[PDB]
Amino acid sequence: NLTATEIVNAIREQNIQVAAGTIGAPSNSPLQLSVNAQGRLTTEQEFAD
Amino acid sequence: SAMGVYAALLGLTVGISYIVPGGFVPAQDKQYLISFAQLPNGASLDRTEA
Secondary structure (H helix, E strand, C coil): CCCHHHHHHHHHHCCCCCCCEEECCCCCCCECEEECCCCCCCCHHHHHC | CHHHHHHHHHHHHHHHCCCCCCCCCCCCCCCCCCCCCCCCCCECHHHHHC
């Protein structure tokens, strides 16, 4: 009970890179740490999952 | 003897042409100097400011 357009939207949604940012970047904190997450998929298994 | 002296001087020139160190442009003064400060990694801008 599925359509092709929904499939395309689903695959496009779950294969986008994310820009997180920085913690401690106007703040009085003595540490400045960048934040990174998992973005684009690489292998065939991840695409099939 | 003049020819021998000339040959000796030519040899001396060839020998002395190899002892001077090389270079391109001498380092002169341009009325200013630079100073770098490096903090431990992860430091905020306030510490560098101070």
